[PDB]
Amino acid sequence: ASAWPEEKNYHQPAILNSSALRQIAEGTSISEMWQNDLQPLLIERYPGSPGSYAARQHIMQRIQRLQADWVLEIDTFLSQTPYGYRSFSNIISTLNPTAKRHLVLACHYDSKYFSHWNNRVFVGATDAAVPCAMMLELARALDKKLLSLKPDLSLQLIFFDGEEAFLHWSPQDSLYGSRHLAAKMASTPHPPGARGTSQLHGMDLLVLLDLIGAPNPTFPNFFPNSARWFERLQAIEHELHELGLLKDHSLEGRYFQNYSYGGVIQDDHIPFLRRGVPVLHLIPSPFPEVWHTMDDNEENLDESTIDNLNKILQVFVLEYLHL
Template sequence: MAGGGNLRVVDTLRLLLLVAALPLVSRGVSRGAANWTQEKNYHQPALLNLSSLRQVAEGTSISEMWQNDLRPLLIERYPGSPGSYAARQHIMQRIQRLQADWVLEVDTFLSQTPYGYRSFSNIISTLNPTAKRHLVLACHYDSKYFPHWDNRVFVGATDSAVPCAMILELARAVDKQLLSLKMLNLKKARIVYNLSYNTADLHKNISDSKPDLSLQLIFFDGEEAFLHWSPQDSLYGSRHLASKMASTAHPPGARDTNQLHGMVSPGLIDLTGFNWSSKPNISQLFPKHCQMVS
């Protein structure tokens, strides 16, 4: 990752930092403007000024990312392997070290593969699970399985250890700001509690004081095909998690909405760190949300 490759990692990391900072500065929308599931279509992100941008960027360190986040991931880690378990533990431990108190969930399941049933585990880290909407950054942490490769090991640095490390680094870089935001919201909730005189007002006011937009980091398992890419042999983790989220009510107790409705501009980072082009390639598959990354 020397030279040009390093610069491309820096460029992409800066972009991720801008996205991660959106919950800190977003203007949001009027409460009565639209159904909450449609608010993402009207969301107006605030622009960071130069001083704020510099403050966020100064918290990043490529050398720390390389040493603390990336190096432990440069191992063979296909689903069900010892390396997969080690990578999963590493990702979770790095997140658990953060002060902002992310809520971790491991989505473990069995799925049929060309080599029989295999175990897969997605990692979902949510800053505030009670928020209606979550700005999602995702990557996959598994590596491609090569059963016969002349005794060599495929570690998948760009595909996709580097994106995992970048997401971990950005979470560390904005940790203090996210913690401050959580403390501010907690303080507001306490004020609301002290000013409420009956249970009905209490629940209504606390609900109104909850942050409407938060962050969610997803590390998928089983993105790679075991043999040949097909609808059945690929995307094991994302297919399972999408199905699970579609059947999970959100907010809790809702009848007509699920966790997928709460996703805002999901961004998938993949194949990062190579030297194929002068800058990262951003595929804008959702035109309504291009303003979030343009």
């Protein structure tokens, strides 16, 4: 009986030295992400809408142009909703599908439904167009390194559909894509041919990005079983800061602070967390002031903060993967 699903418990990062940290800082471009990955997603894209289709095509196209061997899968399903049966489509992008273990980065790509109000349209810039663009920029920036994966451990990106409630949050109206995918992964043997392990056993850690892009975010350390990875984000932030590789940033105003949060925040990690998957939930507390208002738009995003977080996340991912 292999103990491979226990490997994630002892897995340690391969820490980058100063020269490598400078290379990563210089290799990501916030203005390219902004133009090429983010702006095309700043559209109405509630489930089933034309915008949902356009967002999905954009995400797939941006991944398909990369050199690394990404395998794209669209996970389409039906669910009951306050408006009757509807269809949803999760996007899964995976390097080394048969690899036993994957580090998983995720966000939701749907935008919350709102009828137009005084000619304003809700585009959910921090929620979660920026997180989607950060995942696309990371895939682009680390492409040469990821190409080398073509430790049975690799990378997977999930863009969930239907994270938002069609009305206000309730247990049955929200998290459509993640409740569906967690149950599908829990009942899918992995690796192929396995007798008793599932794709969830293969998920080393689910790093879920949401509500990112406003000024002064503070991310709490939510869960004890991922606390040592939260500490790694703190260390990376601190070292990039000390190397002068972050912009408009101070340690008193750092993003990863020493403080927990005992309450529950409803998000796409919930169906995974309740099936035993370790989660690092990169959502700030408090939420951006523009949360669920028409002001969650491009104008209210903080460019240098998003840039700093791209650098921290990319370093975290290379260190976890030993790349």
